[PDB]
Design a protein around this ligand. Structure first.
Ligand SMILES: CC(C)(C)OC(=O)Nc1sc(-c2ccccc2)cc1C(=O)NCCc1ccccc1
Ligand code: NA
Lengths: 328, 346, 334
């Protein structure tokens, strides 16, 4: 099992990931990240070539979405169904109507008797952690109020690694430069992907309009990670409030969502970027990216969204399998 | 493969043509495609009535997106997918505005179509379905929109008729089908769609309505051009009546529409129109012996419960037929390939 | 071949009788059918706790119709169908009036039953379930209605009891089970249903309630006629208390009910110290105050196992009604 230059011992990494709960991106170590990246790639190729995808038959999951949150929920459903497993849904409900005079711990202790695993989206942070403590079965966090969204970070990382595979090498001569653009204060997807990218040889351009800057405790978490692998320097973190400077010499531009510009992306504002730059956005997009950019080959935000299917298939396969592997 | 015992269906070739086809309007189905649908529907009807293996399409994952409540069509599409042995994720009980929460229809469909092999979409907006089709990398079946496009209702309507009157397929100048459309012909879009499809054949039409709720001119024009084009138009081709006693005479089919009180000024107008067009065993005594009664449902008072025991009533068979017709259409579009041994064949 | 310790089960014969049966009330289950359910439930419990293949009912497509919020029962029936290897479409987020949008219950059920092999139906109206059964070409499982019929709640309650006290099946005049029902005995319909089923056996009852919320006479009468039928009725058979201290003495089972206060009877480790060693505590759930979280660590608490058992009991009932099967070798036998 190879992804160019690293052999992955998938048997051994699955033994370790079996019945693992995934709440935060920090619950995924280096070895587990390689296994996910590798397996995601196998599912991408199997599905793009119309091959049998049914690597996880015989499982029954529960999907609990207590805010309307249709793309992430459908992505998890499709992944389960394409793997050949089954799922029952709780949707179109909020906290109060689902927990109708019942504790979170009662609800999860009972629900986990019915199913092999639970996928849970709840805008409360407390609820996901209470569910994990109460559940006899593994939980995948599909997004909560603390800004934990592990599968968004994983699919973001998979997407980058697909155009810039050298991010995995921890090579002091091969650095990736990324610009994060928009609302860096409220854009939790930046916070989570930053922590994961900072384990690697990466330098960051934070591009925001003063009022919406990256929070200090993320800058600190980036600086501790980069220091730990001896890739911190005074040039590791740069701050801009304009595109013209922010977007210069970055392999990746990652746009965030807003609501109420310095930061609208046009073919014009992209003429002076590297020819290899790729554009991500977790979606949905509003004005941050003009429709004309969809025809620009630097745009990969729809491939990115597509990649969430393969990454969620991979993560469900590695946690829930009982045991050959997807290959080719 | 034979239909009517006259017309040979090369299902391999017709599948190659229908593969990854979107079905939005009944005019997206040609003569050959309609034969393959009718034939395949009949095989699913017999396999299921005999408790045989129905799993002729197993490895597919669909998304079903219903942005207005419409329980029977949605459940019928679910059942069809599941009976074929495929899988479906559902968006229900939601409207346009809450599902498109500050996202364009084009963004939503471009992404959703990466997840799945095909989409079933019901939206009361007509624009939305056409935008979905333009944005989607995967086929769409329109399960109903605001323009009155509802191709699987028309298809299951036609399947039902063809089961009692198979000669409608022959385009034989000696073998004419006579149908009465009864009730709200202005707002009954199922009449509009079925009319267009029937007018490809040797058919004459009785439009039975009171003044205010008559068939629109643009449908009469489309029926008249279709009948002319196959040299079946005469001054007899389209008649208009305001009462059952005349309207229901010498028709093979009576097709009753919904007369929703919210289409009148008040109750007195409703209950006058109601009552004038209500179907009883009495109002059916001077129809042909062979007359069959359709209604797209749901039923309110348009038809009295006593008529359910009358052998001329088939509106519950009609609704059941939607399962077989939706199984057929899904099989023909989404199969990756054929053998002659992979086809349903009772 | 099919044994339940010392009851031999003729599953072929009992399935011939249960095939395409509708189950609306606990009285639609006779002695033989109850043994088939108990036996099949036990096989599913062991297969699933040992991670074996559970797919004993492939190729069916069900419709599950929930016209009130009723999340646990609905998820339990979904899980059961999916674990058996069959498929389901769901109608939820609906009440009576919005689902029957100017359509009769009989029209809706006549049509829906053409699509599917079976229907699971929860509706707070009692009329609706009985009209559904009259109109349907396919079998219905009642998942709960307004008359307090909830057959799979009673069945999973009974399965739970029989697991700790298997002698309830023997109808042995020397082996009596003592149960206390605690809380709102007037509105607690699962007491009503389980009482009727327990009273087919050698059972005595402690009804513990204030005064305003006492067991209704019609249930006392139905318990007395059942117990008389097997000559287990005596003036000792039914006792009435207004306090836990007396009510809870010498009972093998304590069954706590929901009381939505729309204080006397909260269960604590303290109020449990002088119960039998062997007493088990049920509660149909959800619980609010009736049982303190401290009791969850008490080994007498089984209300979470009880709720888990609903999976195995719903798998069993679906298998026994819907199987297309003939042969003794196809049945689960851990
Ligand atoms: C994290 C991801 C993107 C996977 O989660 C979803 O997609 N769910 C969500 S949270 C959301 C939102 C918007 C405003 C305020 C608060 C939350 C957008 C949405 C969302 O789904 N599209 C909004 C409208 C829409 C729904 C589905 C498809 C297309 C458009
Ligand atoms: Na599903």
């Amino acid at each position: 099992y190879i992804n160019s230059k690293y052999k992955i011992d998938l048997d051994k990494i699955m033994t370790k990931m079996k019945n693992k709960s995934v709440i935060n991106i920090d619950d995924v170590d280096d070895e587990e990240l390689l296994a996910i990246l590798y397996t995601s790639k196998q599912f991408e190729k199997i599905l793009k070539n119309n091959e049998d995808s049914k690597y996880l038959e015989n499982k029954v999951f529960c999907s609990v979405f207590l805010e309307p949150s249709t793309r992430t929920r459908c992505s998890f459903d499709a992944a389960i169904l394409k793997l050949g497993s089954k799922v029952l849904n709780i949707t179109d409900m909020n906290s109060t109507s689902f927990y109708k005079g019942e504790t979170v711990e009662d609800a999860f202790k009972i629900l986990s008797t019915y199913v092999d695993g639970i996928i849970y989206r709840d805008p409360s942070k407390k609820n996901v952690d209470i569910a994990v403590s109460s559940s006899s079965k593994p939980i995948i966090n599909a997004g909560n109020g603390t800004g934990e969204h592990p599968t968004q970070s994983l699919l973001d990382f998979y997407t980058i690694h697909n155009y810039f595979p050298f991010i995995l090498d921890r090579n002091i001569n091969k650095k990736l430069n990324i610009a994060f653009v928009g609302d860096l204060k409220n854009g939790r997807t930046v916070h989570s992907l930053s922590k994961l990218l900072s384990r690697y040889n990466v330098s960051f351009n934070f591009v925001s309009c003063k009022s919406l800057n990256i929070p200090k405790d993320i800058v600190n978490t980036i600086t501790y990670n980069l220091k730990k692998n001896n890739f911190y320097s005074d040039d590791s973190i740069k701050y801009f409030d304009n595109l013209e400077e922010g977007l210069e010499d970055v392999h990746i531009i990652y746009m965030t969502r807003i609501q109420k510009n310095a930061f609208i992306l046009s073919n014009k504002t992209l003429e002076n970027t590297r020819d290899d730059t790729k554009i991500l956005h977790p979606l949905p997009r509003v004005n941050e990216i003009k429709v004309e950019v969809d025809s620009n080959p630097k745009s990969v935000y729809f491939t990115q969204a597509e990649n969430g299917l393969y990454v969620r298939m991979a993560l469900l396969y590695l946690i829930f399998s009982s045991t050959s592997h997807p290959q080719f």
